[PDB]
Amino acid sequence: YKCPYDFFADRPGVRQCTACPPLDLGGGNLVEQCTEDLGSQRCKPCSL
């Protein structure tokens, strides 16, 4: 199955997509990360 919208996977043979992790751009700042397309393997900061 394609990974869901906010989930991603990198290793080819995998058993579960992992939720996108909040990117930390410094000290104590966490920006939520969300993928653009449905079946994706990388997380963008989902404010942009």
CB of 47 to a copy of itself, least distance (A): 4
31 is a contact residue toward a copy of itself (CB under 8 A): yes
CB of 11 to a copy of itself, least distance (A): 28
- Which stretch in 5-13, 14-22, 23-31 sits in contact with a copy of itself by CB under 8 A? 23-31
25 is a contact residue toward a copy of itself (CB under 8 A): yes
* Inter-residue contact 23 to 13 (CB < 8 Å): no
Closest C-alpha to 20, from 12, 48, 40: 40
